[PDB]
Every structure is written in C-alpha cells, then in structure tokens.
Write a protein that binds this ligand. Structure first.
Ligand code: ZN
Ligand code: ZN
Ligand code: ZN
Lengths: 34, 92
C-alpha cells in the first residue's frame, strides 16, 4: 500500500494535547474566585 | 489567579491519582475493602457496566475513564488490563 500512511497526522497525539488541556474539565468546573 | 487554563502538569497527577482508584476498583473483589477512593470508584467502574448514555455524551464519568485509560493505555501493550476503558482503547 501507499507508505504515506505512516507519515500522516496522528489523531491520537493531537488527542493527548487536548486531554492534557482538558481531560474532563466538565467535572472539574474549576473557578478562580479572584 | 495562578492559571486561566488547565496545565498538563496538574491534570497529569490528577489523572494518576484517579487512575490509582480506577485500576484498583476495577479488579478489586475484596468486599472488606474500605480504602479512600476504590469504594466510590467501584460504582464508577460499575457505572460503565450498562452505559448507553455515554454515546450521547451524557457520561462525564465514562469521559473520565476514557480520559484516564487513554493516558494509562499509552504505556499499555497488553490485551487484558484492570481498568475498563483501557481495553476499549485497544478496540481501535
Ligand atoms: Zn478495593
Ligand atoms: Zn458511563
Ligand atoms: Zn492498561
């Protein structure tokens, strides 16, 4: 097959960054009461 | 103050703590178990048992298991694993 498949954008690594930013911030509901 | 966004530093350890709960509660068959989180986290693992609400985005808990197990499975190459959603990751 086309070997370009091994040099595509990894959905899994983009996911990681997203998860490192908001893994599940919906339960957090973190507020800064300044 | 501190941070307007959620840093990967804090979420990392946050997950890991939760994962301790998840990995234990997932396989824990000890009824006498009376630790801090396993008991509660048990009902969380037990929540996913009959979850169909997750596919409609109504599971913040399954969102967590997904969240943590994906991270946990980042270092998993086993087909069998304690937590529920780790094997879900492997289904892809
Ligand atoms: Zn336990
Ligand atoms: Zn669920
Ligand atoms: Zn695993």
């Amino acid at each position: 097959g086309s070997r370009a498949s091994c040099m595509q954008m990894d959905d899994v690594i983009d996911d990681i960054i997203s998860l490192e930013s908001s893994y599940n911030e919906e339960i957090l509901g973190l507020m800064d009461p300044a | 103050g501190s941070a307007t966004q959620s840093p990967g530093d804090s979420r990392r350890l946050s997950i890991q703590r939760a994962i301790q709960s998840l990995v234990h509660a997932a396989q824990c068959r000890n009824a006498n178990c009376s630790l801090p989180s396993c008991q509660k986290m048990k009902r969380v693992v037990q929540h996913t048992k009959g979850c169909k609400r997750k596919t409609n985005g109504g599971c913040p808990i399954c969102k967590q298991l997904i969240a943590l197990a994906a991270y946990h499975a980042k270092h998993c190459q086993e087909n069998k694993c304690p937590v529920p959603f780790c094997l879900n990751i492997k289904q892809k």
